[PDB]
Each structure stands twice: as C-alpha cells, then as structure tokens.
Design a protein around this ligand. Structure first.
Ligand SMILES: CCCCCCCCCCCCCC(=O)SCCNC(=O)CCNC(=O)[C@H](O)C(C)(C)COP(=O)(O)OP(=O)(O)OC[C@H]1O[C@@H](n2cnc3c(N)ncnc32)[C@H](O)[C@@H]1OP(=O)(O)O
Ligand SMILES: CN(C)CCCN(C)c1nc(N(C)CCC#N)c2sccc2n1
Ligand SMILES: [Mg+2]
Length: 411
C-alpha cells in the first residue's frame, strides 16, 4: 500500500499506534559518521540545488514554484500563495540551517522542479500526561520519563513537486535527501503536518473558519449561503449581519507588540504552552522572530494596562489564488497563531483578533482545534470546515493524543 512509507521509521498502522505507551525513537541509534556524505542519487538530468532563502532572487524562484504548484483544493478553486516575505520568515528563524532547504532543478535550463524545507524547532515531545499516569500505575515511570527534556529537532514544510512531475516518485527522493541532510547535523527526528492521511498521525484536528467578508466568500464559492438563510427576504443581508464585527478593538490597552515586550510575552506564552503535551520551547530570539509584527506576514498585539503586558495574540497571513473569478484574484486569510490570556477570557481576546483582521482587509480567519481553540468556537461564530490537519513525527513513537493537547502551530 505504501511503497515508500513502509520503508521509513514511522508507526505503520493505528493498531501499532495503539500499542505505543512511551515516547522514544523508532530506529537504531546512528551517528553522523554513519550517514552518507554524498547527496542521495538522482537522475542524471536533474540536480540538487540549495536556495539561499535570505536572497530575494532565490526566494522568488521558490515562491513561483509554490504559487503555481503547491496545495490546492480538489475542485481546483483555490491554491495557496505564500508570499516571498512569508517564506523568508518561515524558513530562516534563528539558527536555521541553510542546507535544510532542498530543491531539485532540471540541469539543462535550470527549471525548478521540487522543494522541501526543514527548520530547527525545540520541542517538548516526551510521554504525554495521560500515558505518564498509566506508567505510574504500572511502576514504569522511569521508562516514561526518559525523553521528557525538550529536544532540538527538524520541522518539515513546503514539500512540493511541479505538476508536470507528479506521480513519478520524486517526493520520496526529496524526503530521503532532506533526511540525510538533517541526520548529517546529528538530528534524528522531525515533526510535520499534512491534510492527507499517511502512516500514522499522533494527533488530528479539524479546521475551523470564521467568515469576515461573507459577500466575497460566497462570490468566490469558498462559502455558500446556508439553507436556513433562505427563510429571509434578503439572505445575503442577513448573512452579512450575522458576521458583523466592531470597527475597532474592544480591549483597553490593546496595541502592537514591540521589542521591549519580548521577555513578558515569552514568559506568559511559555507558562501557557507548558499545559499541553506537545509544544515548542522558544528563546527570546525565537519569540522575537516568530511574534514581532512583520508587514504582510505576522500581526501581533499585546494587552497592556497600567504598564504591564497581561495577554497577547498573533495571527499570520496566507493568501490563496482564486482560480478564474471575474471580481477577485485573491482570498486573504488570517490564521490564528500563538496567544496567551491571563487577564481576560480567551473569547474576549480572540474577538479583538477578528476585529483587527477584519479592519485590515482579511476575508476569513482560519485555525485548527489545537491549543484552547475549541473554547471560543461557538461564541465567536467559527464553523468546522471539511479539512483535517494531521500531526506526524518521523522516527518517534508517540501515544495518540487529542488535538487540544497540541501546542505547535504549523505555518
Ligand atoms: C530526521 C529528519 C527527517 C526529515 C523528513 C521527515 C518526513 C517529512 C515527510 C514530508 C512532510 C511534508 C509536509 C508538507 O509539506 S504537507 C504539503 C504537501 N504538499 C502538497 O500537497 C503540494 C501539492 N502536491 C504535491 O506537490 C505532490 O503531490 C507531493 C509532493 C505532495 C507528492 O508528490 P507526487 O504526488 O508526485 O507523488 P510521488 O510519486 O512523488 O510520491 C508518492 C509518495 O509520496 C507520499 N506522499 C504524498 N503526499 C505526501 C505528503 N504530503 N507528505 C508526505 N508524503 C506524501 C505518498 O504517500 C507516496 O508514498 P507511498 O504511499 O507510496 O509510500
Ligand atoms: C503545512 N501546513 C500546516 C500549511 C497549512 C496549509 N494551510 C494553510 C491550510 N491547509 C488546509 N488543509 C490542508 C486541509 C486539508 C485536509 N484534510 C486548510 S483547510 C482550511 C484552511 C487550510 N489551510
Ligand atoms: Mg513525482
């Protein structure tokens, strides 16, 4: 069934997943010296290329591949259009490894055919709370605790093969070369997500959407007018009214995050994320990188009253190309990023996210039911979509956990 995935160190079935009781590696311990020094073999008409994702022109080359060949829906209505500024932000965090950005070009004329990217992340990925209780009940605490310490691993994203090269087994080659480059730096696990089901997720969550511009969403067929609104003389007027938001934030002391806020935002974020089984650990440099505002890319606000930051939220922008509409070329989506609330209920904090996103011309707010995202779904009028986001590890056995025990946002 899976000619490539069956050869890899990942749990092969749900049944296998059911028997996993402790976090730990799947594979034998290996050393850098055991890993081939030479790139993985590739057809003589192709070549490996490492783009410089801080150099405008290489960023643009990768941007065009993704613009034209990255994730699209099954009805080919929308295709993600991650911006050049977003890609530099996502792929070049503190201490990133340029070698983990891997491309294939056709040698002749240098057409770009494929990409995959890894970035470092420090992840808590030790045995989850409910399985540590089971271990305690059996006298197996030491085994369960072995990998409690946060680990420096690889996060993989942006796997893409050109549409003309699909179903030729190029993605496994990209994956094998990425793995080799990661292993050559003495890193042996990765974390990744996908909308598709592969062997075998450790967690899965539904996607949720919150309409900000329903007229546009219906025009481009992201949304339709729900059946219940047909009982009204003006269905669309009633739909617009249902999703109306304030024109300015409601929380006193909301303002954009600045450099001086990094220590307090790090503190409140890390205290919050500790509550979840799987989550990132961020240094001050990483809090700076992932949360300070970047035009067009990431938007972060703090609540500060009386000289103290007590809460914050962040969202990031991913537009999609709208394939063939005469009124609109783009869907402008805002995705819920990290947040922490200590002074107000989460729904009150995230309402301001929706208000700011709407004010800035976003059409929809998206999120997965990770973190405490379920706590404000109903009041804030999110609805489940048809997608799921599945969380995977490479070379890591891990008990199944609920998505409300995951605190890693994947871009
Ligand atoms: C220690 C360090 C380790 C680092 C590596 C960790 C692993 C990272 C793994 C990557 C995580 C990426 C996270 C993201 O970026 S998820 C985003 C993925 N990108 C897209 O969906 C963009 C649009 N589609 C494409 O570009 C192509 O269809 C892709 C490239 C997805 C496959 O190309 P193509 O359609 O031309 O197929 P093939 O003939 O070359 O290959 C077929 C094989 O590929 C397996 N396949 C299909 N889709 C995915 C998928 N999303 N993750 C993993 N495997 C996938 C499939 O089951 C089959 O294997 P098997 O069933 O036969 O066994
Ligand atoms: C790797 N990485 C995490 C990027 C996420 C891709 N983004 C932004 C995304 N992806 C969705 N799906 C793949 C659902 C597929 C299924 N089942 C959806 S569905 C609604 C928004 C949305 N956005
Ligand atoms: Mg292929």
């Amino acid at each position: 069934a899976h000619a490539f995935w069956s050869t890899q160190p990942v749990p092969q079935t749900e049944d296998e997943t059911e028997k996993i009781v402790f976090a730990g590696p799947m594979d034998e311990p290996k050393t850098v010296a055991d890993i081939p020094e030479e790139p993985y073999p590739i057809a003589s008409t192709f070549e490996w290329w490492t783009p410089n994702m801080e150099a405008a022109d290489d960023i643009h080359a990768i941007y065009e591949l993704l613009r034209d060949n990255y994730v699209e829906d099954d009805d080919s209505m929308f295709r993600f259009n991650y911006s050049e500024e977003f890609l530099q932000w996502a792929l070049c965090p503190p201490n990133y490894i340029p070698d983990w950005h891997v491309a294939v070009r056709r040698k002749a004329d240098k057409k770009l055919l494929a990409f995959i990217a890894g970035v470092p992340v420090t992840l808590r990925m030790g045995t989850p709370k409910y399985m540590k209780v089971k271990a305690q009940e059996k006298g197996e605490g030491e085994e369960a605790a072995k990998y409690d310490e946060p680990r420096h691993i690889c996060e993989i994203n942006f796997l893409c093969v050109h549409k003309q090269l699909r179903e030729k087994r190029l993605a496994p080659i990209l994956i094998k070369e990425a793995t080799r480059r990661v292993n050559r730096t003495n890193v042996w696990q990765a974390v990744y997500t996908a909308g598709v089901l592969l062997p075998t997720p450790y967690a899965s969550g539904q996607y949720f959407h919150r309409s900000l511009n329903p007229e546009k969403l219906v025009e481009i067929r992201f949304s339709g007018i729900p059946a219940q609104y047909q009982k009204f003389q003006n269905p669309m007027a009633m739909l617009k009214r249902n999703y109306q938001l304030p024109s300015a934030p409601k929380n006193s002391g909301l303002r954009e995050m600045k450099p001086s806020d990094v220590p307090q935002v790090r503190r409140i974020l890390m205290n919050y994320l500790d509550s979840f089984d799987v989550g990132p650990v961020f240094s001050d440099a990483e809090i700076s990188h992932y949360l300070l505002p970047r035009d067009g890319v990431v938007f972060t606000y703090v609540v500060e009253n009386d000289k103290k930051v007590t809460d914050f939220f962040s969202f990031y922008r991913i537009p999609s190309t709208v394939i063939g509409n005469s009124n609109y070329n783009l869907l402008n989506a805002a995705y819920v990023h990290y947040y922490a609330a200590t002074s107000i209920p989460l729904h009150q904090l995230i309402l301001d996210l929706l208000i700011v996103a709407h004010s800035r011309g976003f059409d929809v707010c998206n999120m997965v039911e990770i973190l405490d995202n379920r706590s404000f779904v109903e009041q804030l009028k999110f609805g489940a979509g048809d997608g799921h986001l599945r969380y995977y590890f490479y070379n890591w056995a891990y008990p199944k956990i609920k998505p409300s025990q995951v605190a890693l946002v994947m871009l």
